[PDB]
Structure formats: structure tokens, C-alpha cells
Amino acid sequence: NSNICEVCNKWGRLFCCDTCPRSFHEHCHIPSVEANKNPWSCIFCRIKTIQERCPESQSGHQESEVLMRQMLPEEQLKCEFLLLKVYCDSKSCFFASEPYYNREGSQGPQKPMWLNKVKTSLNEQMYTRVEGFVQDMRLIFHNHKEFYREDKFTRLGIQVQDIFEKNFRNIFAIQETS
């Protein structure tokens, strides 16, 4: 197994996957690494199993249909993985914790949002459809763009949103377009 966390690329107290070489800190994995279970399979393995059990699940889908899906176990998992994929980028540090807004010439957003809040909301099963999760994720980046205006710092929102969106298309097998 790897000697660094797959998500944050640091060493420390790591839990190893039994079915692939990845390793995780406890609260870097999503959901948090489970107490018992031997063997244990990580989220990457669990997602691969879904695909292998239903190869047709990788045929293209319309985003509008994906968003209206109910958060049953498999969609719950897919959202957990998509969230994990954003945490895997180091630039997620800017969006992880609760932000605050005091900048000359800007007003803070009406509905602040951050990745740890989405993490908790998933953990507490507060989303009933994929749409709920996706709207909150997109809101993180949209609030950032709007607040930072012409500051070049706005680019961090663009960058991390692109990671999100690419992984969304991959995980939920959105029909490729030009």
C-alpha cells in the first residue's frame, strides 16, 4: 500500500485499502474510515464495483436526469466520491472551512457555503436528491466569483469548479458533448 494519504498526500495515521494500494487518513476518506470491517474497501473500490456490476451505468446520461435522482445508497456514494475528488486537489483548502467577507467594495453572499458544510450535510443525509448536493457545490464557487470580482483570486474558484465539473461528468457518466 501507499505510504501517503490519497487525498492530502501527507503521511500520518493511515488506514490501508484491502483491494487496492491506496491509503487514507481517517477523516480524509469519505465517509470516515469505518471502525471495524476486515477486509475494508475504500470509496475508489466501491465505485469501481458499482460500474462492474452494471456496465450500462457508464453509457451517457443527461445532467437533468442525474440531478432529479433520489439519494439512494448508490447516489449517496457517488456524491461522497465526487466530494472526495474535490478535496484531493490542494486548492480545496480555500473552500474547506467557513468563510468570512470583509472587503472594500464587495458584499458577502446571501448564502455562504463551504466543503465541510457539504461533508456534514451528506453525513447527516440532508440531501434527498443529487440536485441538492450539486447546487451547494456549485454555490461554493459562484459565491467566490461574485465576491472577489476582478481580483485575480477569483481564478481559484474557476480552477476548483473545473475539478468538480470534470469529476461530476465522469462519476455520473454525463453524455459527452462539444
Ligand SMILES: [Zn+2]
Ligand atoms: Zn489525508
Ligand SMILES: [Zn+2]
Ligand atoms: Zn481501494
Ligand SMILES: [Zn+2]
Ligand atoms: Zn446488468
